[PDB]
Model the fold of this input.
Amino acid sequence: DSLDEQRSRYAQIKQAWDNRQMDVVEQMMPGLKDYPLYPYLEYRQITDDLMNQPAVTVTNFVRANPTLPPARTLQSRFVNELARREDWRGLLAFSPEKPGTTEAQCNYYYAKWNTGQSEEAWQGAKELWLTGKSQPNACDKLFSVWRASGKQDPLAYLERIRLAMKAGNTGLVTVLAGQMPADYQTIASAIISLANNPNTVLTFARTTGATDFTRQMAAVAFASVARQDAENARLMIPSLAQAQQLNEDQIQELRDIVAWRLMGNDVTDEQAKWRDDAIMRSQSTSLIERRVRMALGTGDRRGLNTWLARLPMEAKEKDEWRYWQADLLLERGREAEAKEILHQLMQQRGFYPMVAAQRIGEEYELKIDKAPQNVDSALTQGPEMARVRELMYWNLDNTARSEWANLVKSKSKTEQAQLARYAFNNQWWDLSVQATIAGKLWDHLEERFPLAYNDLFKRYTSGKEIPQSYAMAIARQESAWNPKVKSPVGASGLMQIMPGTATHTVKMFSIPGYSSPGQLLDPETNINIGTSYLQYVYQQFGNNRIFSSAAYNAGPGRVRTWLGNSAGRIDAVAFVESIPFSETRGYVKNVLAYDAYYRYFMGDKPTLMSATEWGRRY
Done:
């Protein structure tokens, strides 16, 4: 036998198993015991008949496979199975300690109650209860018996309502209030009305006694009202403050809430004056920063000076604010002071340090820490690494990611760097990036920005205007090089392409061969469709990477709106910094920094922006 022969038998047994040709599977299983992925086959066998498995079989498998990710998840999964059988005694015998998942924990504590450990059951129940998030259905029976025992503090019940409201879980707020303990029955209907429609907030505030609870509940509803109609909320502050006898801090929180909603281009002069007075009296760093961004997005020089100075000392430490302080100083003619800030920034890593270098006409110096010369350690010669190798061979990147996660966890920085380089040397691009993240090896640039799928990116950008380095930067930001990753909303693969976008792109470009979103998990297909959409937004916005990156993340419509807002009054850096969506602003900064890294590794000059991008009016 050999690893090569085992590989063929492995693919063949899975093919048989998928077809339920169990006579073939039964005959082949024993012969695969020496293959690294045999534990995955055992896991499949055990789980295939989980409802009839004795606990001893599961316990033996879990103990025999301490580093196998699915053996670890099987512990909580089997706890849930024992709960399904109502085998409470067995559940605790199988899992004497609190399990890993929330659902398994709900069942563990219910098992404790069933086996006479009420005090312990209630301690667990309370911990699971104190969250605004909706918990597993398994916890319902636990919360029910907990309340039935008389040991559930009514204050804990009311606290969950507050947490649910703050989390925006109005459905849970309503369910809880509908089953309100007698202690607070008098405000139940009012709470249900508030969760149903936040516009009942002033009525809620006037008809209930003002307490820390009702004030916090009203403040959340008030924020919802402001999101719908900022003016209605602004005008309500005096009445709300009077109805609940709000203190200065509470009134200022209400002012902050409204000010956040008066950041649009549409605001009246009366509203803008009120907003700025509110921000002047604010303690909110994020609100002041949003106001600074408004000044940057409109070319307001006096405003930038005024608002940057209102930031607390701590916020002024941020890269962006140090650069904009330098920008103000340069205009004021304070060359030395400004350039010292820029030179200090250049010593650092990232977007602003690169902006700083381009601003003063100096070449940015990339700090590149190297991994050890010797990458071979016990960690690269063990059974877990052998499983990783097989998983990568079969392109099972998501499964490999879980194994790799265990391998890099709790290791020294040196070991994590060796593992990153070992992955890099084997062209396991996603694993290389994953290891740099685990070890926070931020300056190990080569391993953080591998030349992944180089030939494919070259081929698919040769007939387009988007640079190869740029397409690679976008993919690096989107997937961290894992071709099999899918987001919760369905974005898929290397360039995180949404099914709708793929369909629309294939029609617009007359691309052949695409019939299902599942094809987006294939590297070439993904690069083909993704480079096509990227090229589309690139040409649409005049071959400008700031616009195409923003359009790829937020859609062309949003970029048009943003450009209509700045209206040609600002520079490239001010346009990036003033993008109102924090996610898109960060995305653009990352992609531009990554494109420079890619250009460097491809042998080109890593200047942050082209002369055209740098000098254009935004």
Q: What stands out?
A: The domain at 376-445 is CATH 1.10.1240.20 (Methyltransferase, Methionine Synthase (B12-binding Domains); Chain A, domain 1). The longest helix spans residues 582-601. The chain has three domains: 1-363, 376-445, 446-618. The chain has 36 helices and no strands.
